[PDB]
Design a protein around this ligand. Structure first.
Ligand SMILES: C[C@@H]1CC(=O)Nc2ccccc2N1
Length: 113
C-alpha cells in the first residue's frame, strides 16, 4: 500500500516545519543523553526516547511502513517532554509550540494519504 519514497515525500514537510521552529525545536534536535545532560533519572521516567534526528533518520531509511507509525513517534517525543518537565519550563513550553505546529500540519497530510 505505501511506497517508501512517496511516504517520505508526503510526511517530510511536516517534520521540516518542526525543524523550522527556532528556538522551539532546539531541545528536540538531538537524542537526550542523560549522563551528559546532568539529568540521570531521565531513562527511569522516559522508557522510549525519541527526538527529531531519530524521526528524520527513520523517515529517510524506510523504517515507517505506514503513516501512523511516524505520527506515533512524533507524539512519543512530545509526550516524553510533557511527562518529564515542569509545565512552565522552557522544554515543556517549546514542546507545546512544536505540537501546535504539528497538529496544524499533519491533519490534511494524513487525510490525503
Ligand atoms: C528534551 C530534552 C530532555 C528533557 O525532556 N528535558 C530536559 C531537561 C534538561 C535538559 C535538557 C532537556 N531536554
Amino acid at each position: 500500500i505505501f511506497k517508501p519514497e512517496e511516504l517520505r515525500q508526503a510526511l517530510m514537510p511536516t517534520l521540516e516545519a518542526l525543524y523550522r521552529q527556532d528556538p522551539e525545536s532546539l531541545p528536540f534536535r538531538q537524542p537526550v543523553d542523560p549522563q551528559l545532560l546532568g539529568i540521570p533519572d531521565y531513562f527511569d521516567i522516559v522508557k522510549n526516547p525519541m527526538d527529531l534526528s531519530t524521526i528524520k533518520r527513520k523517515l529517510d531509511t524506510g523504517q515507517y511502513q505506514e503513516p501512523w507509525q511516524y505520527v506515533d513517534d512524533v507524539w512519543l517525543m512530545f509526550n516524553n517532554a510533557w511527562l518529564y518537565n515542569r509545565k512552565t519550563s522552557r522544554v515543556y513550553k517549546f514542546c507545546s509550540k512544536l505540537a501546535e505546529v504539528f497538529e496544524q500540519e499533519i491533519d490534511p497530510v494524513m487525510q490525503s494519504l
